[PDB]
From a paper:
Genome segregation is a fundamental process that preserves the genetic integrity of all organisms, but the mechanisms driving genome segregation in archaea remain enigmatic. This study delved into the unknown function of SegC (SSO0033), a novel protein thought to be involved in chromosome segregation in archaea. The segC (sso0033) gene encodes a 165-residue hypothetical protein of unknown function. SegC has a tertiary structure folding similar to those of the ThDP-binding fold superfamily, but SegC shares only 5–15% sequence identity with those proteins. Surprisingly, we found that SSO0033 exhibits nucleotide triphosphatase (NTPase) activity and assembles into filaments in the presence of nucleoside triphosphates (NTPs) and DNA.
After several trials, we determined the crystal structure by soaking apo-form crystal in crystallization solution with additional 20 mM ATP. From Fo – Fc ligand omit electron density map, we observed an additional electron density in the interface of the two dimers under the ATP-soaked condition, which was not observed in apo-form density map. Based on the shape and size of the electron density, we can only fit an ADP molecule. This indicated that the ATP molecule has been hydrolyzed to ADP. In this SegC-ADP complex structure, two residues (Tyr61 and Arg73) were found to interact with ADP. Residue Arg73 forms hydrogen-bond interactions with two phosphate groups, and residue Tyr61 is involved in a π–π stacking interaction with adenine. Since the ADP is positioned at the interface of the two dimers, we also identified two residues, Arg22 and Asp25, from different molecules. However, these two residues are located more than 4 Å away from ADP. The results showed that the NTPase activity of the SegC-Y61A mutant was increased 49% relative to wild-type SegC (SegC-WT), whereas that of SegC-R73A mutant was decreased by 35% compared to SegC-WT. In addition, the SegC-ADP complex has a different catalytic site compared to that of E1b-ThDP, and both Tyr61 and Arg73 are involved in SegC NTP hydrolysis activity, but neither is located in the ThDP catalysis site.
Residue numbers in the entry:
A (entry chain A), B (entry chain B): 1 to 165
């Protein structure tokens, strides 16, 4: 069921390593959860994994130099424009501000949440908790090598430089 | 004895596909042969394969968006400048001019060459004949696959954006 969500988090994580030398964040992975739940909610800010969840490999063409995705068709924005009442992953604009707290949802406890509130918070170490869930269920290293080879096949289609425009 | 030369031709072909989405030219391959005979001769324009021969994976950091390499430490120059008495791959600068001809050198005959003419010529389908040699010696697919893993390993650790500077 969460097969769409956990795949996004592995693929975004590999692509981000190819593109910026590092892997996805606590809050960037959190954005994939929020979007797995509310599929017509605009995700503003650090939103790379939501963008893989909604766009597949095609997010690769829309990622800004910041790792934020602009793709208004899939309601992904890097900053808040007028009238977008979306979730702001680590920013103060939009309708709903998502950041980190001691007493903030876990990976499990967030999937459960039935409402959307004016302020959303997620637990420290959200990525570590979410990688363990995926690890117990999948062979993640077999997936990562398959992810890298497909992302490279994408990038090599028109070449890195094409993909930058 | 020629392994190092034939590895550069297979590594550059995999790297150019990742950067510009297409293989290497007849003349880009020819430049590597030249780099192999004349270890101090400066090579000007169309030098992606001579760059791998002279720099290894460290060439990825010195590629212009044209796929020409600028590394003066290694006597590699994308355009001719005053006083660089080198071979010019498919330009009219420097001292020697390398260009395709109907009668030009073969891979075997260019290797066997002893002089340095004021004008070298390589046969049409220099790349075809050169890939037909290398394919008789190794399972090239096992190489391209390794070259990719190592090219990606290099790109990734920096981040594609660090590398494009
Ligand atoms: N640079 C491009 N190259 C090829 N096709 C494109 C390009 N830009 C847009 N399209 C196409 O135009 C249509 C509109 O897409 P668009 O709304 O521009 O995408 P996005 O919401 O990701 O910015 C789509 O069918 C898409 O496939
Ligand atoms: N990880 C890296 N390892 C080695 N060289 C790098 C790396 N990242 C970037 N470079 C760049 O590659 C180039 C290779 O050296 P070169 O231009 O020949 O001599 P110099 O050291 O004088 O700049 C340098 O311009 C350097 O800034
Ligand atoms: Mg060409």
């Amino acid at each position: 069921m969460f097969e769409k969500l956990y795949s996004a988090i592995i693929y975004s994580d590999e692509f981000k390593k190819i593109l910026l030398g590092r892997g996805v964040d606590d809050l960037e992975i959190a954005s994939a959860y929020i979007a797995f739940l509310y599929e017509d909610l605009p995700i503003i800010g650090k939103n790379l994994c939501a963008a893989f969840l909604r766009m597949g490999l095609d997010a690769v063409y829309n990622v800004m130099p910041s790792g934020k995705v602009y793709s208004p068709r899939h309601k992904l924005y890097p900053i808040s424009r007028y009238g977008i009442d979306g979730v702001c992953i680590n920013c103060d604009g939009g309708k709903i501000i998502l950041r980190i707290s001691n007493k903030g949802y876990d990976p499990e406890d967030l999937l459960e949440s039935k409402g959307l509130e004016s302020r959303i918070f997620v637990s420290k170490n959200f990525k570590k908790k979410s990688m363990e869930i995926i690890e117990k269920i999948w062979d993640v290293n077999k997936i990562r090598l398959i992810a890298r080879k497909e992302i490279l096949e994408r990038i090599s289609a028109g070449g890195i430089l094409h993909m930058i425009r």
